Amino acid sequence: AGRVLLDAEDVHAAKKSHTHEVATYTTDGFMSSFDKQKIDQLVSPEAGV
Amino acid sequence: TEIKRMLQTKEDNSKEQFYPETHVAGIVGLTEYVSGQLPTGVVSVNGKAGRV
Ligand SMILES: [Fe+3]
């Protein structure tokens, strides 16, 4: 009661600035920065015949 | 600055107190009095009240 300060905690909600764990071999999650750093440099397959 | 109760003589023998009507603009401390009132429960939620 009184002056009540409500944030995402007392409602058990995710923060606006929140991040999930990176995906593992058996877990689903964010894609890691170095995963993309490996992906982009990986040249696309060459289409010949 | 005294509060005087007005007395009026009834028909048989008595002298009863009677009240005069006043307008809401007449009482001199009414607005401060109603301003000083505070809500019992949550006054405001996250800086906002009423229909929240
Ligand atoms: Fe999320």
mmCIF file with all atom_site columns, C-alpha atoms and ligand atoms in Angstrom:
data_model
loop_
_atom_site.group_PDB
_atom_site.id
_atom_site.type_symbol
_atom_site.label_atom_id
_atom_site.label_alt_id
_atom_site.label_comp_id
_atom_site.label_asym_id
_atom_site.label_entity_id
_atom_site.label_seq_id
_atom_site.pdbx_PDB_ins_code
_atom_site.Cartn_x
_atom_site.Cartn_y
_atom_site.Cartn_z
_atom_site.occupancy
_atom_site.B_iso_or_equiv
_atom_site.pdbx_formal_charge
_atom_site.auth_seq_id
_atom_site.auth_comp_id
_atom_site.auth_asym_id
_atom_site.auth_atom_id
_atom_site.pdbx_PDB_model_num
ATOM   1   C  CA . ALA A 1 1  ? 0.000   0.000   0.000   1.00 0.00 ? 1  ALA A CA 1
ATOM   2   C  CA . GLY A 1 2  ? 0.974   3.663   0.035   1.00 0.00 ? 2  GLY A CA 1
ATOM   3   C  CA . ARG A 1 3  ? 3.280   4.837   -2.737  1.00 0.00 ? 3  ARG A CA 1
ATOM   4   C  CA . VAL A 1 4  ? 4.122   1.611   -4.579  1.00 0.00 ? 4  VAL A CA 1
ATOM   5   C  CA . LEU A 1 5  ? 6.975   1.267   -7.066  1.00 0.00 ? 5  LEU A CA 1
ATOM   6   C  CA . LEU A 1 6  ? 6.251   -1.481  -9.595  1.00 0.00 ? 6  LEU A CA 1
ATOM   7   C  CA . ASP A 1 7  ? 8.811   -2.911  -12.005 1.00 0.00 ? 7  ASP A CA 1
ATOM   8   C  CA . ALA A 1 8  ? 9.199   -6.178  -13.920 1.00 0.00 ? 8  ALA A CA 1
ATOM   9   C  CA . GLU A 1 9  ? 10.295  -7.975  -10.743 1.00 0.00 ? 9  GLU A CA 1
ATOM   10  C  CA . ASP A 1 10 ? 7.119   -7.955  -8.645  1.00 0.00 ? 10 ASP A CA 1
ATOM   11  C  CA . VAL A 1 11 ? 5.151   -9.016  -11.741 1.00 0.00 ? 11 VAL A CA 1
ATOM   12  C  CA . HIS A 1 12 ? 7.834   -11.617 -12.615 1.00 0.00 ? 12 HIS A CA 1
ATOM   13  C  CA . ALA A 1 13 ? 8.298   -10.230 -16.130 1.00 0.00 ? 13 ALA A CA 1
ATOM   14  C  CA . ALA A 1 14 ? 11.376  -10.037 -18.330 1.00 0.00 ? 14 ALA A CA 1
ATOM   15  C  CA . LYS A 1 15 ? 13.234  -6.731  -18.373 1.00 0.00 ? 15 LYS A CA 1
ATOM   16  C  CA . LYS A 1 16 ? 13.258  -4.637  -21.532 1.00 0.00 ? 16 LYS A CA 1
ATOM   17  C  CA . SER A 1 17 ? 17.068  -4.922  -21.547 1.00 0.00 ? 17 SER A CA 1
ATOM   18  C  CA . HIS A 1 18 ? 17.297  -8.685  -21.073 1.00 0.00 ? 18 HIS A CA 1
ATOM   19  C  CA . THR A 1 19 ? 19.212  -11.368 -22.961 1.00 0.00 ? 19 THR A CA 1
ATOM   20  C  CA . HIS A 1 20 ? 18.974  -15.155 -23.056 1.00 0.00 ? 20 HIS A CA 1
ATOM   21  C  CA . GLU A 1 21 ? 21.804  -17.663 -22.824 1.00 0.00 ? 21 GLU A CA 1
ATOM   22  C  CA . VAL A 1 22 ? 23.610  -18.688 -25.999 1.00 0.00 ? 22 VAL A CA 1
ATOM   23  C  CA . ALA A 1 23 ? 22.392  -21.929 -27.554 1.00 0.00 ? 23 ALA A CA 1
ATOM   24  C  CA . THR A 1 24 ? 24.347  -25.075 -26.685 1.00 0.00 ? 24 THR A CA 1
ATOM   25  C  CA . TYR A 1 25 ? 24.498  -28.556 -28.202 1.00 0.00 ? 25 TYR A CA 1
ATOM   26  C  CA . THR A 1 26 ? 21.244  -29.446 -26.400 1.00 0.00 ? 26 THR A CA 1
ATOM   27  C  CA . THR A 1 27 ? 19.852  -25.975 -25.611 1.00 0.00 ? 27 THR A CA 1
ATOM   28  C  CA . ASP A 1 28 ? 18.030  -23.359 -27.684 1.00 0.00 ? 28 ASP A CA 1
ATOM   29  C  CA . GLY A 1 29 ? 19.032  -19.716 -27.350 1.00 0.00 ? 29 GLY A CA 1
ATOM   30  C  CA . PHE A 1 30 ? 20.706  -16.647 -28.842 1.00 0.00 ? 30 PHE A CA 1
ATOM   31  C  CA . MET A 1 31 ? 23.187  -16.956 -31.693 1.00 0.00 ? 31 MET A CA 1
ATOM   32  C  CA . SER A 1 32 ? 26.665  -16.012 -30.521 1.00 0.00 ? 32 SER A CA 1
ATOM   33  C  CA . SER A 1 33 ? 28.637  -13.101 -31.949 1.00 0.00 ? 33 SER A CA 1
ATOM   34  C  CA . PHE A 1 34 ? 31.583  -15.263 -32.980 1.00 0.00 ? 34 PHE A CA 1
ATOM   35  C  CA . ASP A 1 35 ? 29.168  -17.716 -34.608 1.00 0.00 ? 35 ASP A CA 1
ATOM   36  C  CA . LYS A 1 36 ? 28.145  -14.926 -36.989 1.00 0.00 ? 36 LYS A CA 1
ATOM   37  C  CA . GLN A 1 37 ? 31.787  -13.871 -37.314 1.00 0.00 ? 37 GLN A CA 1
ATOM   38  C  CA . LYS A 1 38 ? 32.465  -17.414 -38.539 1.00 0.00 ? 38 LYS A CA 1
ATOM   39  C  CA . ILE A 1 39 ? 29.332  -17.528 -40.712 1.00 0.00 ? 39 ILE A CA 1
ATOM   40  C  CA . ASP A 1 40 ? 29.806  -14.334 -42.721 1.00 0.00 ? 40 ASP A CA 1
ATOM   41  C  CA . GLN A 1 41 ? 33.402  -15.052 -43.763 1.00 0.00 ? 41 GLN A CA 1
ATOM   42  C  CA . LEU A 1 42 ? 32.274  -18.526 -44.872 1.00 0.00 ? 42 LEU A CA 1
ATOM   43  C  CA . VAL A 1 43 ? 32.040  -18.130 -48.644 1.00 0.00 ? 43 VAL A CA 1
ATOM   44  C  CA . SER A 1 44 ? 28.794  -19.200 -50.285 1.00 0.00 ? 44 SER A CA 1
ATOM   45  C  CA . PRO A 1 45 ? 28.992  -22.367 -52.417 1.00 0.00 ? 45 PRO A CA 1
ATOM   46  C  CA . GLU A 1 46 ? 30.072  -21.728 -55.997 1.00 0.00 ? 46 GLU A CA 1
ATOM   47  C  CA . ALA A 1 47 ? 27.382  -22.503 -58.586 1.00 0.00 ? 47 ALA A CA 1
ATOM   48  C  CA . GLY A 1 48 ? 28.992  -23.784 -61.772 1.00 0.00 ? 48 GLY A CA 1
ATOM   49  C  CA . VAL A 1 49 ? 27.388  -26.608 -63.756 1.00 0.00 ? 49 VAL A CA 1
ATOM   50  C  CA . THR B 2 1  ? -12.690 33.969  16.686  1.00 0.00 ? 1  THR B CA 1
ATOM   51  C  CA . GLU B 2 2  ? -15.251 32.124  18.796  1.00 0.00 ? 2  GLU B CA 1
ATOM   52  C  CA . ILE B 2 3  ? -17.893 29.589  17.792  1.00 0.00 ? 3  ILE B CA 1
ATOM   53  C  CA . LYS B 2 4  ? -21.267 30.675  19.175  1.00 0.00 ? 4  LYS B CA 1
ATOM   54  C  CA . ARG B 2 5  ? -24.280 28.356  19.193  1.00 0.00 ? 5  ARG B CA 1
ATOM   55  C  CA . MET B 2 6  ? -27.466 30.211  18.273  1.00 0.00 ? 6  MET B CA 1
ATOM   56  C  CA . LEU B 2 7  ? -30.358 29.652  20.688  1.00 0.00 ? 7  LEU B CA 1
ATOM   57  C  CA . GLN B 2 8  ? -34.027 30.073  19.760  1.00 0.00 ? 8  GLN B CA 1
ATOM   58  C  CA . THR B 2 9  ? -37.098 30.015  21.991  1.00 0.00 ? 9  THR B CA 1
ATOM   59  C  CA . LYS B 2 10 ? -39.614 27.273  21.231  1.00 0.00 ? 10 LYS B CA 1
ATOM   60  C  CA . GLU B 2 11 ? -43.359 27.574  21.686  1.00 0.00 ? 11 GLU B CA 1
ATOM   61  C  CA . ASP B 2 12 ? -43.968 26.059  25.128  1.00 0.00 ? 12 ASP B CA 1
ATOM   62  C  CA . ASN B 2 13 ? -41.014 26.683  27.474  1.00 0.00 ? 13 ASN B CA 1
ATOM   63  C  CA . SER B 2 14 ? -37.764 25.637  25.825  1.00 0.00 ? 14 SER B CA 1
ATOM   64  C  CA . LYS B 2 15 ? -34.707 27.242  24.222  1.00 0.00 ? 15 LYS B CA 1
ATOM   65  C  CA . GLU B 2 16 ? -33.087 24.952  21.652  1.00 0.00 ? 16 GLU B CA 1
ATOM   66  C  CA . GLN B 2 17 ? -29.943 25.405  19.609  1.00 0.00 ? 17 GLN B CA 1
ATOM   67  C  CA . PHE B 2 18 ? -30.547 25.954  15.898  1.00 0.00 ? 18 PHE B CA 1
ATOM   68  C  CA . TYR B 2 19 ? -28.156 25.963  12.965  1.00 0.00 ? 19 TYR B CA 1
ATOM   69  C  CA . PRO B 2 20 ? -27.982 28.435  10.063  1.00 0.00 ? 20 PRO B CA 1
ATOM   70  C  CA . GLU B 2 21 ? -27.332 27.329  6.504   1.00 0.00 ? 21 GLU B CA 1
ATOM   71  C  CA . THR B 2 22 ? -23.905 27.999  5.025   1.00 0.00 ? 22 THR B CA 1
ATOM   72  C  CA . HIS B 2 23 ? -22.552 27.870  1.492   1.00 0.00 ? 23 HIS B CA 1
ATOM   73  C  CA . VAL B 2 24 ? -19.464 25.851  0.621   1.00 0.00 ? 24 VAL B CA 1
ATOM   74  C  CA . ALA B 2 25 ? -17.731 29.156  -0.168  1.00 0.00 ? 25 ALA B CA 1
ATOM   75  C  CA . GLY B 2 26 ? -18.500 30.370  3.361   1.00 0.00 ? 26 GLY B CA 1
ATOM   76  C  CA . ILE B 2 27 ? -16.418 28.037  5.511   1.00 0.00 ? 27 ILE B CA 1
ATOM   77  C  CA . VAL B 2 28 ? -12.918 29.479  5.684   1.00 0.00 ? 28 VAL B CA 1
ATOM   78  C  CA . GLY B 2 29 ? -10.843 26.330  6.235   1.00 0.00 ? 29 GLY B CA 1
ATOM   79  C  CA . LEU B 2 30 ? -12.813 23.786  4.227   1.00 0.00 ? 30 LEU B CA 1
ATOM   80  C  CA . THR B 2 31 ? -10.512 23.570  1.201   1.00 0.00 ? 31 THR B CA 1
ATOM   81  C  CA . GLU B 2 32 ? -7.388  23.080  3.323   1.00 0.00 ? 32 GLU B CA 1
ATOM   82  C  CA . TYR B 2 33 ? -9.310  20.470  5.321   1.00 0.00 ? 33 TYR B CA 1
ATOM   83  C  CA . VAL B 2 34 ? -10.308 18.411  2.282   1.00 0.00 ? 34 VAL B CA 1
ATOM   84  C  CA . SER B 2 35 ? -6.806  18.846  0.841   1.00 0.00 ? 35 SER B CA 1
ATOM   85  C  CA . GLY B 2 36 ? -5.275  17.479  4.047   1.00 0.00 ? 36 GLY B CA 1
ATOM   86  C  CA . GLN B 2 37 ? -7.273  14.266  3.700   1.00 0.00 ? 37 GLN B CA 1
ATOM   87  C  CA . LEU B 2 38 ? -5.174  11.313  2.553   1.00 0.00 ? 38 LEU B CA 1
ATOM   88  C  CA . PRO B 2 39 ? -6.381  8.040   1.008   1.00 0.00 ? 39 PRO B CA 1
ATOM   89  C  CA . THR B 2 40 ? -6.256  4.970   3.222   1.00 0.00 ? 40 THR B CA 1
ATOM   90  C  CA . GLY B 2 41 ? -4.893  2.370   0.795   1.00 0.00 ? 41 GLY B CA 1
ATOM   91  C  CA . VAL B 2 42 ? -2.431  2.784   -2.058  1.00 0.00 ? 42 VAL B CA 1
ATOM   92  C  CA . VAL B 2 43 ? -2.340  6.516   -2.786  1.00 0.00 ? 43 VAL B CA 1
ATOM   93  C  CA . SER B 2 44 ? -0.818  6.021   -6.246  1.00 0.00 ? 44 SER B CA 1
ATOM   94  C  CA . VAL B 2 45 ? 0.724   3.254   -8.357  1.00 0.00 ? 45 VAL B CA 1
ATOM   95  C  CA . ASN B 2 46 ? 3.924   4.087   -10.262 1.00 0.00 ? 46 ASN B CA 1
ATOM   96  C  CA . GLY B 2 47 ? 3.122   7.779   -9.892  1.00 0.00 ? 47 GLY B CA 1
ATOM   97  C  CA . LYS B 2 48 ? -0.476  7.467   -11.137 1.00 0.00 ? 48 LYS B CA 1
ATOM   98  C  CA . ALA B 2 49 ? -3.794  6.952   -9.343  1.00 0.00 ? 49 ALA B CA 1
ATOM   99  C  CA . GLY B 2 50 ? -7.528  6.830   -9.954  1.00 0.00 ? 50 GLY B CA 1
ATOM   100 C  CA . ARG B 2 51 ? -8.382  4.648   -12.926 1.00 0.00 ? 51 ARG B CA 1
ATOM   101 C  CA . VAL B 2 52 ? -5.038  2.843   -13.138 1.00 0.00 ? 52 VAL B CA 1
HETATM 102 FE FE . FE  C 3 .  ? 12.995  -12.108 -24.643 1.00 0.00 ? 1  FE  C FE 1
#
